[PDB]
Structures are given as structure tokens and as C-alpha cells.
Design a protein around this motif. Structure first.
Motif, PDB file in Angstrom:
ATOM      1  N   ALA A  18       0.811  -1.208   0.000  1.00 41.58           N
ATOM      2  CA  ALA A  18       0.000   0.000   0.000  1.00 41.58           C
ATOM      3  C   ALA A  18       0.847   1.262   0.000  1.00 41.58           C
ATOM      4  O   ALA A  18       0.295   2.366   0.010  1.00 41.58           O
ATOM      5  CB  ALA A  18      -0.940  -0.001   1.196  1.00 41.58           C
ATOM      6  N   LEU A  19       2.171   1.124  -0.016  1.00 40.25           N
ATOM      7  CA  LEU A  19       3.052   2.276   0.062  1.00 40.25           C
ATOM      8  C   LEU A  19       3.365   2.896  -1.290  1.00 40.25           C
ATOM      9  O   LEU A  19       3.805   4.052  -1.327  1.00 40.25           O
ATOM     10  CB  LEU A  19       4.358   1.885   0.757  1.00 40.25           C
ATOM     11  N   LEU A  20       3.195   2.153  -2.390  1.00 40.79           N
ATOM     12  CA  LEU A  20       3.465   2.701  -3.715  1.00 40.79           C
ATOM     13  C   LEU A  20       2.504   3.830  -4.064  1.00 40.79           C
ATOM     14  O   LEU A  20       2.915   4.994  -4.109  1.00 40.79           O
ATOM     15  CB  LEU A  20       3.384   1.600  -4.774  1.00 40.79           C
ATOM     16  N   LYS A  21       1.231   3.493  -4.320  1.00 42.86           N
ATOM     17  CA  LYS A  21       0.062   4.380  -4.313  1.00 42.86           C
ATOM     18  C   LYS A  21       0.150   5.678  -5.121  1.00 42.86           C
ATOM     19  O   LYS A  21      -0.723   6.542  -4.993  1.00 42.86           O
ATOM     20  CB  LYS A  21      -0.275   4.738  -2.865  1.00 42.86           C
ATOM     21  N   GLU A  22       1.165   5.813  -5.966  1.00 44.37           N
ATOM     22  CA  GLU A  22       1.556   7.080  -6.578  1.00 44.37           C
ATOM     23  C   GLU A  22       2.575   6.768  -7.669  1.00 44.37           C
ATOM     24  O   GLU A  22       2.748   5.609  -8.068  1.00 44.37           O
ATOM     25  CB  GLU A  22       2.136   8.046  -5.543  1.00 44.37           C
ATOM     26  N   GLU A  23       3.250   7.811  -8.154  1.00 39.85           N
ATOM     27  CA  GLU A  23       4.396   7.679  -9.044  1.00 39.85           C
ATOM     28  C   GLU A  23       5.709   7.501  -8.282  1.00 39.85           C
ATOM     29  O   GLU A  23       6.777   7.818  -8.821  1.00 39.85           O
ATOM     30  CB  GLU A  23       4.491   8.899  -9.962  1.00 39.85           C
ATOM     31  N   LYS A  24       5.648   7.014  -7.045  1.00 46.35           N
ATOM     32  CA  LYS A  24       6.828   6.799  -6.216  1.00 46.35           C
ATOM     33  C   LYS A  24       7.481   5.476  -6.601  1.00 46.35           C
ATOM     34  O   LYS A  24       6.933   4.402  -6.330  1.00 46.35           O
ATOM     35  CB  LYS A  24       6.463   6.806  -4.731  1.00 46.35           C
ATOM     36  N   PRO A  25       8.647   5.549  -7.239  1.00 45.97           N
ATOM     37  CA  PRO A  25       9.407   4.360  -7.607  1.00 45.97           C
ATOM     38  C   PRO A  25      10.781   4.327  -6.962  1.00 45.97           C
ATOM     39  O   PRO A  25      11.161   3.308  -6.371  1.00 45.97           O
ATOM     40  CB  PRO A  25       9.542   4.492  -9.126  1.00 45.97           C
ATOM     41  N   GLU A  26      11.542   5.417  -7.061  1.00 42.66           N
ATOM     42  CA  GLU A  26      12.834   5.542  -6.405  1.00 42.66           C
ATOM     43  C   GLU A  26      12.733   6.251  -5.060  1.00 42.66           C
ATOM     44  O   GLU A  26      13.759   6.647  -4.497  1.00 42.66           O
ATOM     45  CB  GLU A  26      13.815   6.287  -7.311  1.00 42.66           C
ATOM     46  N   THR A  27      11.516   6.420  -4.538  1.00 42.71           N
ATOM     47  CA  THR A  27      11.300   7.112  -3.275  1.00 42.71           C
ATOM     48  C   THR A  27      10.243   6.425  -2.415  1.00 42.71           C
ATOM     49  O   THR A  27       9.747   7.028  -1.457  1.00 42.71           O
ATOM     50  CB  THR A  27      10.906   8.572  -3.526  1.00 42.71           C
ATOM     51  N   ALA A  28       9.886   5.183  -2.729  1.00 43.85           N
ATOM     52  CA  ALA A  28       8.917   4.421  -1.953  1.00 43.85           C
ATOM     53  C   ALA A  28       9.539   3.281  -1.169  1.00 43.85           C
ATOM     54  O   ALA A  28       9.189   3.078  -0.007  1.00 43.85           O
ATOM     55  CB  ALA A  28       7.827   3.858  -2.871  1.00 43.85           C
ATOM     56  N   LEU A  29      10.453   2.526  -1.778  1.00 44.05           N
ATOM     57  CA  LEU A  29      11.116   1.434  -1.078  1.00 44.05           C
ATOM     58  C   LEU A  29      12.207   1.928  -0.141  1.00 44.05           C
ATOM     59  O   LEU A  29      12.638   1.175   0.737  1.00 44.05           O
ATOM     60  CB  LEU A  29      11.719   0.437  -2.073  1.00 44.05           C
ATOM     61  N   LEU A  30      12.667   3.169  -0.316  1.00 41.62           N
ATOM     62  CA  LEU A  30      13.690   3.717   0.567  1.00 41.62           C
ATOM     63  C   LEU A  30      13.101   4.093   1.919  1.00 41.62           C
ATOM     64  O   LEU A  30      13.756   3.927   2.952  1.00 41.62           O
ATOM     65  CB  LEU A  30      14.356   4.923  -0.103  1.00 41.62           C
ATOM     66  N   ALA A  31      11.869   4.604   1.925  1.00 42.86           N
ATOM     67  CA  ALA A  31      11.213   4.938   3.181  1.00 42.86           C
ATOM     68  C   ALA A  31      10.816   3.690   3.957  1.00 42.86           C
ATOM     69  O   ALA A  31      10.716   3.737   5.187  1.00 42.86           O
ATOM     70  CB  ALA A  31       9.991   5.813   2.919  1.00 42.86           C
ATOM     71  N   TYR A  32      10.589   2.569   3.267  1.00 39.03           N
ATOM     72  CA  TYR A  32      10.297   1.321   3.963  1.00 39.03           C
ATOM     73  C   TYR A  32      11.534   0.737   4.631  1.00 39.03           C
ATOM     74  O   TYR A  32      11.402  -0.021   5.599  1.00 39.03           O
ATOM     75  CB  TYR A  32       9.690   0.296   2.996  1.00 39.03           C
ATOM     76  N   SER A  33      12.731   1.113   4.171  1.00 35.11           N
ATOM     77  CA  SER A  33      13.980   0.529   4.648  1.00 35.11           C
ATOM     78  C   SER A  33      14.282   0.852   6.106  1.00 35.11           C
ATOM     79  O   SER A  33      15.152   0.204   6.697  1.00 35.11           O
ATOM     80  CB  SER A  33      15.135   1.000   3.767  1.00 35.11           C
ATOM     81  N   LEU A  34      13.590   1.832   6.694  1.00 37.26           N
ATOM     82  CA  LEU A  34      13.727   2.100   8.118  1.00 37.26           C
ATOM     83  C   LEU A  34      13.122   0.979   8.959  1.00 37.26           C
ATOM     84  O   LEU A  34      13.642   0.667  10.035  1.00 37.26           O
ATOM     85  CB  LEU A  34      13.071   3.442   8.445  1.00 37.26           C
ATOM     86  N   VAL A  35      12.046   0.354   8.483  1.00 41.17           N
ATOM     87  CA  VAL A  35      11.369  -0.713   9.209  1.00 41.17           C
ATOM     88  C   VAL A  35      11.461  -2.049   8.469  1.00 41.17           C
ATOM     89  O   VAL A  35      10.720  -2.972   8.767  1.00 41.17           O
ATOM     90  CB  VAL A  35       9.902  -0.346   9.499  1.00 41.17           C
ATOM     91  N   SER A  36      12.365  -2.165   7.510  1.00 35.68           N
ATOM     92  CA  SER A  36      12.460  -3.418   6.771  1.00 35.68           C
ATOM     93  C   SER A  36      13.184  -4.574   7.478  1.00 35.68           C
ATOM     94  O   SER A  36      12.697  -5.703   7.352  1.00 35.68           O
ATOM     95  CB  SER A  36      13.072  -3.175   5.383  1.00 35.68           C
ATOM     96  N   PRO A  37      14.349  -4.405   8.206  1.00 33.60           N
ATOM     97  CA  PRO A  37      14.990  -5.609   8.767  1.00 33.60           C
ATOM     98  C   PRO A  37      14.238  -6.272   9.912  1.00 33.60           C
ATOM     99  O   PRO A  37      13.971  -7.475   9.862  1.00 33.60           O
ATOM    100  CB  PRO A  37      16.350  -5.092   9.252  1.00 33.60           C
ATOM    101  N   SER A  38      13.885  -5.505  10.941  1.00 33.71           N
ATOM    102  CA  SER A  38      13.267  -6.057  12.141  1.00 33.71           C
ATOM    103  C   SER A  38      11.896  -5.446  12.404  1.00 33.71           C
ATOM    104  O   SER A  38      11.464  -5.346  13.552  1.00 33.71           O
ATOM    105  CB  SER A  38      14.173  -5.867  13.357  1.00 33.71           C
ATOM    106  N   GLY A  39      11.206  -5.032  11.349  1.00 36.32           N
ATOM    107  CA  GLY A  39       9.851  -4.551  11.478  1.00 36.32           C
ATOM    108  C   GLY A  39       8.788  -5.596  11.259  1.00 36.32           C
ATOM    109  O   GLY A  39       7.597  -5.294  11.389  1.00 36.32           O
ATOM    110  N   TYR A  40       9.177  -6.815  10.891  1.00 35.25           N
ATOM    111  CA  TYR A  40       8.234  -7.922  10.810  1.00 35.25           C
ATOM    112  C   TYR A  40       8.784  -9.134  11.546  1.00 35.25           C
ATOM    113  O   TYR A  40       8.027  -9.935  12.105  1.00 35.25           O
ATOM    114  CB  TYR A  40       7.925  -8.270   9.348  1.00 35.25           C
ATOM    115  N   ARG A  41      10.110  -9.270  11.546  1.00 35.60           N
ATOM    116  CA  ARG A  41      10.777 -10.473  12.038  1.00 35.60           C
ATOM    117  C   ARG A  41      10.812 -10.416  13.562  1.00 35.60           C
ATOM    118  O   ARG A  41      11.797 -10.015  14.188  1.00 35.60           O
ATOM    119  CB  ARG A  41      12.169 -10.587  11.432  1.00 35.60           C
ATOM    120  N   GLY A  42       9.700 -10.828  14.165  1.00 40.60           N
ATOM    121  CA  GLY A  42       9.549 -10.755  15.606  1.00 40.60           C
ATOM    122  C   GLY A  42       9.096  -9.404  16.109  1.00 40.60           C
ATOM    123  O   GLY A  42       9.579  -8.936  17.145  1.00 40.60           O
ATOM    124  N   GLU A  43       8.172  -8.767  15.408  1.00 42.04           N
ATOM    125  CA  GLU A  43       7.733  -7.415  15.727  1.00 42.04           C
ATOM    126  C   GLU A  43       6.463  -7.439  16.560  1.00 42.04           C
ATOM    127  O   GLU A  43       5.502  -8.133  16.195  1.00 42.04           O
ATOM    128  CB  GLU A  43       7.491  -6.625  14.445  1.00 42.04           C
TER     129      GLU A  43
END
Lengths: 54, 369
Positions: free
Chosen positions: B29-54
Motif C-alpha cells: 500500500a506504500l506505492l500508491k503514486e508515481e513513487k518508484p525511487e522514493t517508496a522502497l527507501l522509506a520502507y527501509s527504516l522498518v524493513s529488517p526487524s519490522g516484521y521479524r519478531g515485531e
């Protein structure tokens, strides 16, 4: 318990003994606290009169 | 113009409108726009340990911190921050920094009230020290990207400890939760602090992840950036893994404003003092005493003295911080002047230091000198 020597006869003497230092100390305190404010206002400029205005 | 912030939660209101309470398909649900080089970078703050035992897979703060990171205006500074942080989380020198600042991971009424009021006053002075330290980095020549959220975290923790001490003293004196929660959410309003990367740690004990909006991780980060580089770890004669971590450590230490040959070791201990190799150079201890005399006598004498000291005008400090106040004495109002009476032996030492490093001024506000 005598006619001329009642029991309340030391009461007037002990009131007169206390009232001799109370009122003189009250007047002396007014004199000191009223002169000293005038000293501390006068002797900031010209502090040469500090032992003369005492 | 190093950083700018905003606090209106209605501009990017799509990702916070409905009940998006799952990290699963949160990037979908984070894409939602013309965000391609600016959508997966903002997810990278919560990407390593934001699901793995969160826990809960989200919260109110952990998702609002991801869409306040609008990076659409430019994505170079935070990209260098994402490359610099987590390249620093490899060495054991960062690991022991996250152990000293962490756990394992009648008349007695007068004595307890004295402890609580001491806690209140000591944690209340440092909040003011940090509030006059975020206007020093407002000056030209400083930074506002790494300094501003780093010292807006420490002031919040000191305000919480001050309120905790006052509530404890009041609850103890009136006898011999809802009050601490009322001061916790109140400091969550106002401006919005910029983000810093997350600093995940994967060692032999496990996959740990700290936050950098908590004051313990901030207080453990600046102790790492303290010491100067040694004869090893930077030469091209043991080039094993040092040009990716010690270069990152030095670019953070320079991004604060510290020279690569400044030592700055913390001094809070019950042990013996800083021996001789971590002990200052006798033109620094004099300067530190001058800074402590500037802090202890006015609430507004550190920022103009630092502003004058960056211009090389550190001999003119005595006659630029002087100001006049009235005194209603027994002979009328007199308008005396308060001035910082610096001696000459500490007025030339402030000429030895060219510009105060922000890392030194943050050990000054935390109490480590």
C-alpha cells in the motif's frame, strides 16, 4: 497574704521590670533602623563619611 | 539550510486514513503514486526487524515516522545517512557502547525527598542546556541534519526524568501513573524531529535493533564518536574491513564538527580519573572551565559566545555579553551591568580552540566533561 503585702504584689514589679527593656529596645530599634537606611543611601557616592555618619 | 520539517498529518493522509495495522502488505500500500525511487527507501527504516519478531506489526509512532520521511525534495543526504549508519554496526567498539548505556540485553522521608528533588533539578538544568544548544546549530557553518534530532531526543528524556522526580517527591511527601502519562504525551506535541537510520545489530547473541529516538541509543552513539583515530584502523597497510567503518565513523565525527585528533572521553565515574593519555591538553581544561562558567551564570551566554568564537573574536567576549539591569536600591534605580568575568588565562584559551565542535558542546550539556 498580709493586708499591706498581697500575693499579686510581685506581678506589678515583674511587669515593670520587663517593660523597662521592651520599650527602650523598641525605640532604639527604630532609631537604628531609621538612621541606617539613611546611611546606606548617603554613603554609596562619598564613602568617606561612613565612620562619621555612624 | 541543512534540514526542514513539517507537522501536518493531512498531506500524505492516504497511508494513515484506514486501519492499516499490518507490516504485511504495508509496502504494497506504500506505492500508491508515481513513487518508484522514493517508496522502497522509506520502507527501509522498518524493513529488517519490522516484521521479524515485531510486536503488533505497527504502532502509532512507528508508522508516522515513516511517512514524515518525505524525501521527494532530495534523496542524497538521507541516502548517505543510510550508508553511514549500519555500516558502523559491525565493530565491537560499537557493541560495548551499547552495553554501558544498557542493562543486560522520620528522617528517611527527608532523605528520599532529597533524592527525588535532586533528580528533578539535575534533569531539569540539562533540558535548558539542550534548548540553548539547538540554537547554536541554527548559526551559519553548523549542521541541522544530524545535530537537530540528536539533541531533541535528550531534552525530552531529561524533561521526563525531571517530571518523574517531582511527581515522586510530591507523592512521597503527601503520604509519609496518570500524572507521568499526562506529561509523556504532552511532550509528543509541537514540532517534528527528523529521522535518523535505525542501527540494527546482528552479533552472536542475536538480532538486536535500537531506535535512535530513545535517549539511551543517542547517549550511546556520541560516546562512540568520541576518541581520535589511532595509528591503525585508517592506514592502507591493514585494509581488511576498516575503510568502510572507520571512514564512516570519521565522516560522522566531522559531520558533528569534531577534528580527527580530538579525544573527548567521558568522565562520569566513581573510579580514578582520566589517567594521562585520555586527560586533556591544559588548553582544553581551561576552555572547558570557561564554558562551564558561561553555562552556570546566565541562560543566554553560550550561543552568542559561540557565535563570536566562530568569527575569531574570542577576546572580545567580556564586552559583548555585558548587559544592564536595574537595581532599586536605597538611593533610586542604578542600572548595574552583569558581565561574564572571564580571566585572561581562559580568554586566550578560547582563542586556541578555533570553533567549538558540536560533540564537545553536547558532552558539556550532558555532563561528561
Amino acid at each position: 497574704m498580709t493586708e499591706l503585702c498581697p500575693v499579686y504584689a510581685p506581678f506589678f514589679g515583674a511587669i515593670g521590670c520587663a517593660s523597662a527593656i521592651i520599650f527602650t529596645s523598641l525605640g532604639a530599634a527604630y532609631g537604628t533602623a531609621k538612621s541606617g537606611v539613611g546611611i546606606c543611601a548617603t554613603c554609596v557616592l562619598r564613602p568617606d563619611l561612613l565612620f562619621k555618619n555612624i | 539550510a541543512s534540514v526542514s520539517e513539517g507537522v501536518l498529518r493531512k498531506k500524505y493522509t492516504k497511508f494513515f486514513q484506514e486501519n492499516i495495522k499490518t507490516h504485511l502488505d504495508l509496502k504494497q500500500a506504500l506505492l500508491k503514486e508515481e513513487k518508484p525511487e522514493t517508496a522502497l527507501l522509506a520502507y527501509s527504516l522498518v524493513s529488517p526487524s519490522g516484521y521479524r519478531g515485531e510486536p503488533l506489526t505497527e504502532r502509532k509512532i512507528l508508522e508516522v515516522v515513516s511517512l514524515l520521511d518525505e524525501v521527494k525534495v532530495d534523496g542524497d543526504t538521507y541516502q548517505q545517512l543510510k550508508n553511514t549508519f549500519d555500516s558502523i554496526s559491525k565493530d565491537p567498539r560499537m557493541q560495548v557502547s551499547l552495553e554501558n548505556q544498557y542493562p543486560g540485553k522520620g528522617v528517611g522521608l527527608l532523605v528520599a525527598t532529597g533524592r527525588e528533588l535532586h533528580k528533578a533539578s539535575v534533569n531539569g538544568d540539562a533540558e535548558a542546556y539542550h534548548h540553548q544548544l539547538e540554537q547554536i546549530s541554527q548559526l551559519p557553518g553548523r549542521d541541522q541534519r544530524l545535530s537537530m534530532p540528536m539533541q531533541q531526543t535528550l531534552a525530552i528524556g531529561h524533561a521526563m526524568l525531571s517530571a518523574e522526580g517531582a511527581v515522586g517527591a510530591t507523592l512521597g511527601m503527601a503520604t509519609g501513573y496518570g500524572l507521568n502519562n499526562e506529561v509523556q504525551d504532552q511532550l509528543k506535541q509541537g514540532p517534528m524531529s527528523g529521522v535518523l537510520p535505525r542501527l540494527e545489530i546482528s552479533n552472536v547473541k542475536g538480532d538486536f535493533t535500537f531506535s535512535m529516538q530513545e535517549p539511551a541509543a543517542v547517549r550511546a552513539l556520541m560516546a562512540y564518536l568520541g576518541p581520535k583515530e589511532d595509528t591503525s584502523m585508517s592506514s592502507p597497510q591493514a585494509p581488511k574491513e576498516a575503510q568502510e567503518m572507520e571512514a564512516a565513523r570519521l565522516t560522522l565525527k566531522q559531520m558533528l564538527g569534531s577534528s580527527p585528533n580530538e579525544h573527548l572521553v567521558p568522565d562520569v565515574d566513581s573510579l580514578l580519573k582520566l589517567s594521562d593519555e585520555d586527560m586533556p591538553s591544559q588548553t582544553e581544561s581551561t576552555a572547558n572551565g570557561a564554558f562551564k562558567k558561561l553555562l552556570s551564570e546566565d541562560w543566554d551566554w553560550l550561543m552568542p559566545a559561540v557565535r563570536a568564537m566562530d568569527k575569531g573574536e574570542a577576546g572580545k567576549i567580556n564586552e559583548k555579553l555585558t548587559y544592564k539591569l536595574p537595581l532599586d536600591a536605597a538611593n533610586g534605580r542604578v542600572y548595574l551591568d552583569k558581565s561574564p568575568n572571564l580571566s585572561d588565562a581562559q580568554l586566550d584559551a578560547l582563542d586556541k580552540l578555533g570553533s567549538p565542535s558540536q560533540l564537545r558542546l553536547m558532552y558539556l550539556a550532558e555532563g561528561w566533561i
